[PDB]
Each structure stands twice: as structure tokens, then as C-alpha cells.
Design a protein around this ligand. Structure first.
Ligand code: F9F
Ligand code: F9F
Ligand code: PLP
Ligand code: PLP
Ligand code: CL
Ligand code: CL
Ligand code: CL
Ligand code: CL
Ligand code: CL
Ligand code: CL
Ligand code: CL
Ligand code: CL
Ligand code: CL
Ligand code: CL
Ligand code: CL
Ligand code: CL
Ligand code: CL
Ligand code: CL
Ligand code: CS
Ligand code: CS
Ligand code: CS
Ligand code: CS
Ligand code: CS
Ligand code: CS
Lengths: 268, 393, 393, 268
């Protein structure tokens, strides 16, 4: 499969950007998380970024730290996450599905075996948050052997060597960090910026998705206007879950309203 | 691309988010530069001598070994300013921070000794220090938290995850990933991403250098073995480094056995954990079957850490160093024995190293052996822990 | 009849019951013999170096004095094994006990530091130690009482009189008056009957000898003044002794002012008491109008003693040393200032000496002066005392 | 006056030893202490040794430590003690009265003035417990200027030089310590012994009184048989006070019975 390539071609045909929510799998429990994810898709999500709960999410701010904790309170394991993934794919055959992983969960029972399991359930990409390009070889090689896109990160201050490496090594999409620091809606980033977006295109990188701090429709619109192929939003989505824990039907209605507005901002 | 090898065989590396790579590369370059700079070396030596009190003594313990063929010396890091060896490397890292033009320090701490060491170095050298500490540790380490605050450091409780050391480690890295342009992360052991295992070894290696000169002076020969407790690995690698190329000298690292290895309540990942990737490194760690980072356990808060520095994993793999474990009860008996027979109150951490030397002696009392135990710290902080158990006995 | 002068001008003497005179004469003879014996000197120097960690550092404190013409050094007795200067003289007295063939030690203690020092020396050197401590002090010094017991000493509460230090002093002498044939009384300060003020000075005088060599090395000249707190007088006379004949060097002793001299709640008998005869000596003391021995007072338990060594009274009388006082609040501010600006936690006792140096600097900030403060101990023991007051503020 | 010389001459005429109790002045209060002292005399005490309460009685064991504490609980001061002494002398003109002092109470307001006050109230001797012969000069000189006997102590292991000094410097009686240690009935001493008693006589010392640990009639008899002129008992007397605090009439009856038995033992 190449679900991202098909998505980006379709969006390009429509002069449209991608809107890609992040959530933690199994937050606040397996059944509600499956409903959340179906809601995000029905509301207009072009692709998904999905976190496997991890004990030590060191690239995440408090909102997503708390999502991981809620999933653990519900007993969510990586094996349950793969069951969820298989079901999500069985429901939705074309949406690109990306995982947000930390290295130990990939390395734990063997790197090759991890990416083989991703291929089996129909995942499209894996972003390992704590593996920089410098350490990425065995991860990217295993990803490509199993038809999984390895996602790499372009920081705002990326030099030319790093841009070249991210462009060569990544597939699916290039992650364009909006700022330094950790995930969170409370901290708005840049200013993609344009120079980086242009150099990535020059180097034939996978299309750029901007992420970190994207919490409003205006930011989605700006990202696309700057030349990114779309935008990722996590904390802003997860905050709606957190706010409405006691009210699961209201949670779904608010997610739908938010995602619909965010996706609307990506259209030409 | 790096200047130095980030790995010790398969162990080590730089497993941090991409955003932190330039901070690690900058730190490595500044370290390499500082190591060739005689002015930096002279400043560091001056602080170690005139502020921290180096060289520390090497004490022959005759009462402990009476009636056996063991000769035992203790390297007296308990006499260093601050009461533990941690002071050596925080002084060097504070000088690196200043070399790089940074004015702020971030540190993690569990038991609080590293937080206190970081706070004292920062007070001396004009740095603004903030310390992350798991909220459970904050609750149980009031004396150390108060010391940090008296020295002008900000202590920030960490409530995420298990609210203990590993969660404080994460939070320090989260802060650094947004603040590296102005702050240096003063990591507290010989672990984490390169270049920290290397830097911390080199800023602790005077322990072993002095021990070698002192034992040559007193005995005319090298030790048969040097023995050190292993939390993250700093005091042990500081003792071991200068002996690595002296192939006759045994290197013995002692992990905490807690309630016993078989109970699973221990802190001995090097010999009883599983290799993983966390806190910036590939190393043995305490983890669940699924790969969640697990909590360790020891009577000594300072040894209670779920991984180990990568150079120890490497030295073990090639057979250059041997690693063993000592239980809570063994460490407690060594603590009591040193108090009563030598008039020295050892840290419970260090008591693990001493307990293994006592076992070496007692098991084979007619074996001729010249041993050095690294007495990493003093045990004033532990008297109530020891009281509360001996009270329940 | 004695070998040495028991008086310092009018002060001092041997005011003990007749039964104890032979014990004092025996001790004086053994001391005089030991002082001429190069083997005793070598053994004492070896313990001081390799067990206690001498020489202690001399630390230049630049942050404290910024913007003034004061240069301040701290003599780091806080780095000595045990965390205070007391360790020096207990090692020497334990060696004298063994020289005389004694196998038992009696000691008095108030705050507990001398008891701990005595217990550690006795553990090291194979002596059976018993320690008298006023029952009120036992109650308030659990950490020190536990240290003494861990080191194998018997701690005997004293319930007579005021159940504090002076009553423990009496009880130690009562025991000795029946046990001197087998026990040595390890007196804890430079006070009491001859020969103790002399012996304790001579076994502390390395403080000043080292300071002189260190300051000559660093500054090329002697200090303008050396400053030390005065409980009974040991750390101060240890700092002062080697400077007495350097007439340009000021000697400043700092008594505790407590809540203020005018309140009567203080421990400053040298400047604000009245000469009396007690604890074997003629010296200034805290006493009622009728001549009952009164209780003193300081925030620092270690300075809370109702007399002073006779050599200090003498040096004051001839003008060779000047004595001042520092209140609880002044000492607390110095404690906080050293923590925050130098990363050193000083004993509250030593904080009195530091507070007076800070006043010397602040009152006359354009006066060129090279000062040494004797940092007699570390202040880990005081963090909760300091906490509990800063909490109430 | 020389009340001791007259006493010893009278006792010698009768081949009799002296029995000399010690009590603390003002224990357990001034009025009861005056009654105690009258009882001791009526029961046969030949002389008295009387302590002035002191904060730090470092030659005394627990029994007498507790006597000092009781007197302080009653507010007893040295000035009140001198009032008591003057009254005791006004009642009893010939009994020798010795004080047991600690140095600071003598030195406090001037050594000469202290011994002048002793002369004024009719005290015969002063024993300063913490002033050895080596430090005694200003005390013995002031005592003699005011017709007060300075009492010195002969320990059991006294060498010849010390015997000579005690013999030369003392007056009234020579204190013969029965043993090392501190006062107390719980610790019986020696074995005066005879050699010391004989050397003291050779050196024309004041007559010897044995003290420390004398608690039974047999010890009084033995002391006199050994050549001492008599015996002092303190703790054994003070224990009767302590035992009967709640019963002041019983206290007096028991003191009388004890002193009568002790004095009987000194007779030929
Ligand atoms: O909207 P926000 O600020 O919560 O950001 C959500 C991002 N979620 S994610 O899965 O794309 C994502 C991507 C990269 C991350 O770390 C790394 F850059 F180090 F790799 C972490 C999370
Ligand atoms: O019967 P005991 O054992 O209580 O002894 C009672 C003695 N009372 S006393 O006043 O003669 C007396 C005599 C001498 C003392 O000390 C000194 F020897 F050091 F001077 C103390 C008390
Ligand atoms: C912190 C500490 C240790 C353990 O840490 P390492 O990095 O393994 O040295 C051991 N001893 C003492 C006294 C400590 O304070
Ligand atoms: C005991 C003590 C003192 C006071 O005693 P001195 O005999 O006057 O020195 C001062 N400082 C410290 C740290 C002490 O422990
Ligand atoms: Cl909204
Ligand atoms: Cl490798
Ligand atoms: Cl043995
Ligand atoms: Cl400290
Ligand atoms: Cl060997
Ligand atoms: Cl070997
Ligand atoms: Cl391994
Ligand atoms: Cl004189
Ligand atoms: Cl200033
Ligand atoms: Cl100690
Ligand atoms: Cl000056
Ligand atoms: Cl001067
Ligand atoms: Cl004076
Ligand atoms: Cl009876
Ligand atoms: Cs738009
Ligand atoms: Cs031995
Ligand atoms: Cs460990
Ligand atoms: Cs200055
Ligand atoms: Cs004092
Ligand atoms: Cs008789």
C-alpha cells in the first residue's frame, strides 16, 4: 500500500491540505477510544496519528502525558492497541494511519517484529519520537522491509545536512516541527517556516505536515498557505476528551465540531 | 556525526528527540575543547582542591579484617564536600555550562543528593538552578529538599508517571528540549545520551587516579580488586576508569539486590534486567514484559534506579568487570559493622560495596587479597532509616 | 607540683577533689612524654591524615565579599571526618589513653558532637566508651544519641541538677573519681582542670598551623585577623595558637549572644559573666548572684556552655585577643548567606564566627582586610532548627 | 574558739570516738532541717558536718545530690544557711560545726569575706571539696585569719609528701577518705588504713575522722579501733530523710534511733 501517496495526490487535485488529529489509543478506554476515532474520521480527518500508551513519553507535554495515564488506568497494553488498529483498518480502508511510538516499545520484542506487526494490521507509518535520524538506521530499514513509512522530524533550525537526511530517509510525510519543546496546545509555534518547506521540496522529501501547538483553524490555514501539505493537532483534540470524561456523548459532539472546523480550514 | 564514539560496544547512543541533538553536539564539542584546555583543567582542579577538599583520604581498615588475609582500604568520598562523590562531576559540568555561556542549570534527582550537589555548585558558580524531583521523592526527602532551597535552587515536583526518579528524568529532558539555548542539563550519573556517560566518567576519574597513587604509596602494588556500588554508575566508573588498562586489577560493581533477586524487588538491571532504549540510551533496564519502564527497589534511595550506565554494560559484556548484588539486609549489616569497628558511618549506597568486600573476605578468609572499596558517601542521612528497622527488630 | 604551668595568668588551675589529683598528674606526665615522642607524633599525624582527612581546605569566598575590600577565607573544619573540628583532639586523647595503658573512655556531651567524636575515636582505637549526657539533651539530640549507640558507645542520661551539659560534666568527673585507674576522661573542650586546656589546645593547633601555611601560599602574608566561635574554646584556641606570637594578626573570639546580651539569655560569660571556680577551673562563668552555676543559652546547642577556657580569659585580659558576641538572628542570617552564596552549609556554631566577619566587612566595606573564619563544622544537623524558625517567619 | 580540740580532749579522756553526721542545710526545708539537726545532737552527735546547697556537687553521689535538690525546691540560699548556722550555734555552744562547701560558694563574694561570715556565726571548720591541697593557699590562709579550721583530705593512696602537707596545713580534724569515688552508703570503703593513721600521728596531724561509705555501727567501731578519732556518716543519715519525707515525726524518730546506735558504737 501507499496510502499517504494516494491521499496527497487526491488532496492536491483539490488544492486542499490535510488535517490530521492525534489521540492516544485506549484513552479513556478501548470502546470509547474506538468511538472517538470513528468520530474524528466522520468529521473529516484525512489521516490519523495514534499513540501507543508508554510509561515515559518524554516528547509530550501534560495534556498527552495525562492521556497516556488515562489509558493505563484502563489497562491498555500494546497488544490491545494492535487489536484496535486492525479493527480501525477493517472499518476504514484508505485513511492513512500513523503511530507515535517511543523506542523501547519498538525495540522490546525486536524491531523487525514490531514493523511486521504494523504491516499485518495495516498501519502506514511509524514515528519513533526518541530516535533521531542519527540513530535511525535499524528502524528505517525494518520499516521499509515491511512497507511502513518511517517518519522523521525537521526542526525549525534544521541545517542543510539534516534536511538532506530527512528528505532521503523519510517516507509518507515529513514532520515539520513548529517549535522546540514538547507537545502542547498552550505553546504556539511558528513560522513553519517557508525556507524549510522550500528546501524539503527541492530535495524531493515526502510532503510536509506541520505539528506542535496547532490548536485553531487559522493555524491550519496558515500552515497550508506556507506550503505545507497539512497540519497535525494533538493536545487540542485530547483536551476535548479530558474536559468531557464524565459526558461521553458530549465528548463526541465536541470532537466532531472541532475536527469539522479544523478540516474546513484546510480547504481551498 | 559526533567527535567521540557514542557507544560502548552495543550500549549507549543518543536516543533523544531530534530537537535535542544540537544540544548534545554542542555539549560534546565544549567537553572535547575543555579537556584540551589547561585553563579549564586548572580551574576544575582548583575547585576540587580548595572548595571540595580533594584528594580524599584512603583509609586502611584493620579492625574489620582482623584474623583474615584480606587487606581492605576505603576510598573516602564520604569526606568530599557535600558528603558524596557527586560533587566532583557537578563542579566540572557547572564549569562546562559556563564555558558554553549558559547561566541556568536543570537537574533531576531521586534521593536528593544530586539535587543538593547541583544546587551547591550552582550557588558557588553563579548559575540559576532548577531541580525536578518526583513528588513521591519530594515527600520522603524533606531534608534534601530544604538544603536545595537554602542554596537558592527551585525544586519542581513531578507528578506524572510514577512520580519518582524516572519521571523527573523525563521532565528534565522535556524542559531542556525547549530551554537548551540558555540552560545546561546537569545529568546526575554516568548514563543518559552521549556525551553524558563519557563526561561523567571523566569528571569522576580522579577517584581511581588518586586511589592508584595512594595504594602504590602505601602497599607498593595495585589492588587485587576495586569494588563500588552501582546506581547509575558514576562512582563506580570513576573508581574503575584509571584501572581499566591494568588487567590484573579486578573491577567489581555491586547492584542493589533489594529484598532478594528472586522477589523481583531489586535494582539490579545489569545482571537481571533486559536491554531496552530509554533515557537517551540503549542499556539494561527494569521493564515489564511489554516494555514499560518499571520501578526498581532498594533500601538505599540513591541506588534505586531502573537502568545502568552503558559503559558498565559494556565492561560486563567483555568480562573486564564483574557485577554482583547485595540485599538490603547485607547492606544493613555492613553499615552497622563499619560504624562499630571503624567509627565511620557509611552511606547505605556505599554499604552495598562494603558488604560485598566483607563477603569476599568472610567466604575465603585465608585468601590473600588487597581490596579497595569506594566509600561513595557518608551515612548521616541514613541513621533514621537504619533506626526504624533496628527498632522493628 | 606539676610539670607545666596550670594557670594562664589568674585563670585555670586544678580545682578538683584531692582524690583526682593523681589522675591529673598522670595525664600531664603522659602528655609531656607523648609530645617528645616522635612515634606518638607520627601515629597521631597518620590518623589525622588517613582517617580524618587532614589537611582541611582553606576556601576563598569571593561571592560573599563582592564589592568590598574584604578578602575572606574559610578554614574547612566542616570537611573533617565527623563534620567538626572535635575529631582532631579526640584522636590525640584516645592515643594518650592508650599510652597510659587505659582501655576505657568517659566523655561528657551536650549537643552530642563530642559524644559522637569520642565514640568514633573509641571504635577505631579499641576503647570501651561511655558517654554522659543530660537527660534534656538526650531527649533533643536523638540523631547524635543514635550515632553514639551505632558506634558501640554506652550513653548514660544524667538527671541531676538541670539535666544538661554542666550536669553531665559533673557526672563524668564523679565516675572518673572512682574509675581513673582504668578509664581516661576525654574532656570535650579547652577547659576544665589542668592539663586539659593545654592538651586540647595542642591537639587542635594544627588548625592554625595549616591556616598559616595555606594563607602564606595563597596570599604571601598573614591574615589581618582570624575569627572563631567560642563555646568552651577548643576550635578557637586551635586556630589562634600558632598566631599568638604573630603580633600583627588579630585574634577574635565570638561568644553566643542568644536573644541579646541585655536579655540575659546568652552564652557569653567571658565578656558578660563573672569569674568563678567550677569544673576544675577558675574562669568567667554564667552564675547567679549567690554563685550557683546558671544555664546559658544559644540557638546553637554546641555553644551553649556556661564558662570558657582559661586561656581565652587570659588572652582577653592582656589584650592579645578580643571577644565579641553574635545573636541568634545574626547567626541565622550568616547561615543563610553562606548556603546561598557559597554552597556551604555551616554549623550554627560556626555561623557565629561568620556573622562577625560579615559585620566587620559590612560596617567598613572600604577597609582593606584579609580575614580567616574558622568554619568549625558543617550544618546538616541544623537544617531543621533553621527550617522551624524560617517556617515561623 | 577551739571546739574540735576541746571535743577530742574530752573524748580521749573517755577512750571514746566521735560520731559526726552530715546533712544538707535546709533539706527538706529550713524548719524541718533545724529539727533534724537538733535531733542529731540530742541523739548523741559529737560534731556536725553541714552542706550548703550547691548547684553542682561533684564529690557527691545520688543520695546527697537529691538532698541538695530538695533544699533548692525549698528555696534555700547560702544567706539562709548562715542564718540557720547562727541559730544552731546559739542553741548549742560547744558542738563543733563543720561546713561542706564547694569552691564557687566560698570564692563568689570573696574568700576572706566567706570565712569572716563563718567566724561571725560560730562555724568551726570548712571543707572545700573541690580545692585540693595544691590549690588551697588562699582558702587556708583566710580560714586561719578568721579562726576557722581548714579541713583537708587524705586519700587511701596518699604518698608521704601529701601526708606531710595535709598534716601541716589542716586543723581541727584530718579527713580520712575510706575509698575513691563519691559520697554514698551503697559503696563501702576500707581499711582506713592503719599505715596512714599512724603516719598522720607521726606528723602531728589533727585527729583523723574517717568518711565515705560509713553506714553501720560496726564501721564506726572499726574506724575507732583502727586508730581514727571517729567517723562521719552522710548518705545513711540523708536516706532516712528521703525515706520519710511524707512523715516528718517518723523521720525524727528514725534519725534518733540511727544516730543513737551509731554513737553507741564509738564508745569504749
Ligand atoms: O498538537 P500538539 O502540540 O499536542 O502536538 C501533537 C503532536 N503529536 S504527534 O503524534 O504528531 C508527535 C510527533 C512528534 C513528537 O515528538 C518528536 F518530535 F520528538 F518526535 C511527539 C508527538
Ligand atoms: O557517708 P557518705 O558516703 O555519704 O559520705 C559523707 C561525706 N560528707 S562530708 O561532708 O564529710 C564530705 C567530705 C568530703 C567530700 O569530698 C571531698 F572528699 F572531695 F572533699 C564530700 C563530702
Ligand atoms: C548517588 C549516589 C550513589 C549512586 O549513584 P552512582 O551514579 O551509581 O554513583 C552511590 N553512592 C552515593 C553516596 C550516592 O550519593
Ligand atoms: C562543639 C562545637 C563548637 C564549640 O566548642 P569549642 O570547644 O568552643 O570549639 C563549635 N563548633 C562546632 C561545629 C562544634 O561542634
Ligand atoms: Cl473551540
Ligand atoms: Cl554500535
Ligand atoms: Cl575474626
Ligand atoms: Cl551539602
Ligand atoms: Cl585476588
Ligand atoms: Cl585479581
Ligand atoms: Cl547487558
Ligand atoms: Cl596564679
Ligand atoms: Cl555588594
Ligand atoms: Cl560521625
Ligand atoms: Cl586589619
Ligand atoms: Cl590586624
Ligand atoms: Cl575574666
Ligand atoms: Cl537501720
Ligand atoms: Cs484556507
Ligand atoms: Cs588482615
Ligand atoms: Cs541501580
Ligand atoms: Cs572582595
Ligand atoms: Cs559559651
Ligand atoms: Cs566500740
Amino acid at each position: 500500500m501507499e496510502r499517504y501517496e494516494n491521499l496527497f495526490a487526491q488532496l492536491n487535485d483539490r488544492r486542499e491540505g490535510a488535517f490530521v488529529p492525534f489521540v492516544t489509543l485506549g484513552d479513556p478506554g478501548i470502546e470509547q477510544s474506538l468511538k472517538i476515532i470513528d468520530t474524528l474520521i466522520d468529521a473529516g480527518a484525512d489521516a490519523l496519528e495514534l499513540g501507543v500508551p508508554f510509561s515515559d513519553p518524554l516528547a509530550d507535554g501534560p495534556t498527552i502525558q495525562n492521556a497516556n495515564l488515562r489509558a493505563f488506568a484502563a489497562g491498555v497494553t500494546p497488544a490491545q492497541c494492535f487489536e484496535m488498529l486492525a479493527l480501525i483498518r477493517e472499518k476504514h480502508p484508505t485513511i492513512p494511519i500513523g503511530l507515535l511510538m517511543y523506542a523501547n516499545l519498538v525495540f522490546n520484542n525486536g524491531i523487525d517484529a514490531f514493523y511486521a506487526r504494523c504491516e499485518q494490521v495495516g498501519v502506514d507509518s511509524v514515528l519513533v519520537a526518541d530516535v533521531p535520524v542519527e540513530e535511525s538506521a535499524p528502524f528505517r530499514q525494518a520499516a521499509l522491509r515491511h512497507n511502513i513509512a518511517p517518519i522523521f522530524i525537521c526542526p525549525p533550525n534544521a541545517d542543510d545536512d539534516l534536511l538532506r537526511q530527512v528528505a532521503s530517509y523519510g517516507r509518507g510525510y515529513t514532520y515539520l516541527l513548529s517549535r522546540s519543546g514538547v507537545t502542547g496546545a498552550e505553546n504556539r509555534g511558528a513560522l513553519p517556516l517557508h525556507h524549510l518547506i522550500e528546501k524539503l521540496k527541492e530535495y524531493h522529501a515526502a510532503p510536509a505536515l506541520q505539528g506542535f501547538g496547532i490548536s485553531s483553524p487559522e493555524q491550519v490555514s496558515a500552515a497550508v498557505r506556507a506550503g505545507a501539505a497539512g497540519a497535525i493537532s494533538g493536545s487540542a483534540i485530547v483536551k476535548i476528551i479530558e474536559k468531557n470524561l464524565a459526558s461521553p456523548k458530549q465528548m463526541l459532539a465536541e470532537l466532531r465540531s472541532f475536527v469539522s472546523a479544523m478540516k474546513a480550514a484546510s480547504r481551498a | 556525526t559526533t567527535l567521540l564514539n557514542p557507544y560502548f560496544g552495543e550500549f549507549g547512543g543518543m536516543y533523544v528527540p531530534q530537537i535535542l541533538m544540537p544540544a548534545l553536539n554542542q555539549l560534546e564539542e565544549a567537553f572535547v575543547s575543555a579537556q584540551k584546555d589547561p585553563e579549564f583543567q586548572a580551574q576544575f582542579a582548583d575547585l576540587l582542591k580548595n572548595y571540595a577538599g580533594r584528594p580524599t583520604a584512603l583509609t586502611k581498615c584493620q579492625n574489620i579484617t582482623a584474623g583474615t588475609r584480606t587487606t581492605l582500604y576505603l576510598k573516602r568520598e564520604d569526606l568530599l564536600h557535600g558528603g558524596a562523590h557527586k560533587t566532583n562531576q557537578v563542579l566540572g559540568q557547572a564549569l562546562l555550562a559556563k564555558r558554553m555561556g549558559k547561566s541556568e542549570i536543570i537537574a533531576e534527582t531521586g534521593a536528593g543528593q544530586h539535587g543538593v550537589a547541583s544546587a551547591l555548585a550552582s550557588a558557588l558558580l553563579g548559575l540559576k538552578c532548577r531541580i525536578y524531583m518526583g513528588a513521591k521523592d519530594v515527600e520522603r526527602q524533606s531534608p534534601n529538599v530544604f538544603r536545595m532551597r537554602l542554596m537558592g535552587a527551585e525544586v519542581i515536583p513531578v507528578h506524572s508517571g510514577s512520580a519518582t526518579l524516572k519521571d523527573a528524568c523525563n521532565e528534565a529532558l522535556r524542559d531542556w528540549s525547549g530551554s537548551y539555548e540558555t540552560a545546561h542539563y546537569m545529568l546526575g550519573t554516568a548514563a543518559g545520551p552521549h556525551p553524558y556517560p563519557t563526561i561523567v566518567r571523566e569528571f569522576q576519574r580522579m577517584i581511581g587516579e588518586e586511589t592508584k597513587a595512594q595504594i602504590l604509596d602505601k602497599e607498593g602494588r595495585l589492588p587485587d580488586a576495586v569494588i563500588a556500588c552501582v546506581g547509575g554508575g558514576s562512582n563506580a566508573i570513576g573508581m574503575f576508569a584509571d584501572f581499566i588498562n591494568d588487567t590484573s586489577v579486578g573491577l567489581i560493581g555491586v547492584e542493589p539486590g533489594g529484598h532478594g533477586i528472586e522477589t523481583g524487588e531489586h535494582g539490579a538491571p545489569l545482571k537481571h534486567g533486559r536491554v531496552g532504549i530509554y533515557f537517551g540510551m540503549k542499556a539494561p533496564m527494569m521493564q515489564t514484559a511489554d516494555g514499560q519502564i518499571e520501578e526498581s527497589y532498594s533500601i538505599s534511595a540513591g541506588l534505586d534506579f531502573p537502568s545502568v550506565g552503558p559503559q558498565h554494560a559494556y565492561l560486563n559484556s567483555i568480562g573486564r568487570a564483574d557485577y554482583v548484588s547485595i540485599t538490603d539486609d547485607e547492606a544493613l549489616e555492613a553499615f552497622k559493622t563499619l560504624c562499630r569497628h571503624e567509627g565511620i558511618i557509611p552511606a547505605l549506597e556505599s554499604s552495598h560495596a562494603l558488604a560485598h568486600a566483607l563477603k569476599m573476605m568472610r567466604e575465603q578468609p585465608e585468601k590473600e587479597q588487597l581490596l579497595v572499596v569506594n566509600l561513595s558517601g557518608r551515612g548521616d542521612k541514613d541513621i533514621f532509616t537504619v533506626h526504624d528497622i533496628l527498632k522493628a527488630r
